[PDB]
Design a binder for these strands. Sequence first.
DNA 1: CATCTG
DNA 2: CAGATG
Length: 327
Amino acid sequence: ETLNGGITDMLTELANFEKNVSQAIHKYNAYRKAASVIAKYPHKIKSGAEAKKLPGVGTKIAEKIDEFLATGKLRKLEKIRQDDTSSSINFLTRVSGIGPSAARKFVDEGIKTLEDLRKNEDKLNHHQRIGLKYFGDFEKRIPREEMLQMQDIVLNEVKKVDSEYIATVCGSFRRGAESSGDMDVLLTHPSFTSESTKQPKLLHQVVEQLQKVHFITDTLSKGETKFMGVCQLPSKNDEKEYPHRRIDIRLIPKDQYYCGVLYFTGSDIFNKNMRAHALEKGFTINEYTIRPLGVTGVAGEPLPVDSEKDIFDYIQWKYREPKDRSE
DNA sequence: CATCTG
DNA sequence: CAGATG
Ligand code: NA
Ligand code: NA
Ligand SMILES: [Zn+2]
């Protein structure tokens, strides 16, 4: 956690780059289990040969660890941090809609900057365009003070459209957090579930509402169950407009909301633990359901849930207010 | 995983 | 349809 930190981090830069710049998914994958195990390891790696002793710990990586242990740095790492072609891809990639693949293509087309981007707005698709257009706002964190205002609206509109709608803002926002990076709404309706053959209007009617009153600004992607968008809290009394925020809305069959809601609320660490305990208690949990474990090895059959409560109960645990769902 | 592009 | 992004 700090005894093998540098090692783990270097491996991290390394792994990362393999994947992003080079295409080296193997290599890339290599660095990763390696950092992973070194990460676990209870001692102070004092040499490469010592490391080597580990699994995922090959010869090359050991070598690397040596030079790093030997001297406060790594040549290769130094060589990669410089290289404009590398840095380019790390940067282009910051654009919502641009991934590595794309970051590569452009650079080899010579697009390497924001400007470049604008100049070539013809070459980007819709998401990418939006991504570019709001590059700044998009990197800005979201203060819970705004979150509540947001949340405030979404909920009232969902309401007006149908009293029966069920909306929930999950996320860290949900677990307490002072700021969040995006608004994530879990949505369901009685009239929608596991068997119930579809109902797209279910998701599309609210989307519409939100754009109605202009809360929703743009559409990143709009499917029948998940919508990727952009929103914004009406600029008050003109002088202070708000940043454009990323936002997601997703329809859930009523018969699987809470596992969802639970799941989406995190934290990753809380899940796992919760997950592991369910397992003890003779169960299984995932994003959609909780099932009683047969002994034959495994086994299914969806336990029935009406709240986050029903879940804990199942695994017979202390209900946790979201705030304390940290770890 | 669900959506988009081409 | 494969392949990309979030
Ligand atoms: Na991006
Ligand atoms: Na292939
Ligand atoms: Zn020791």
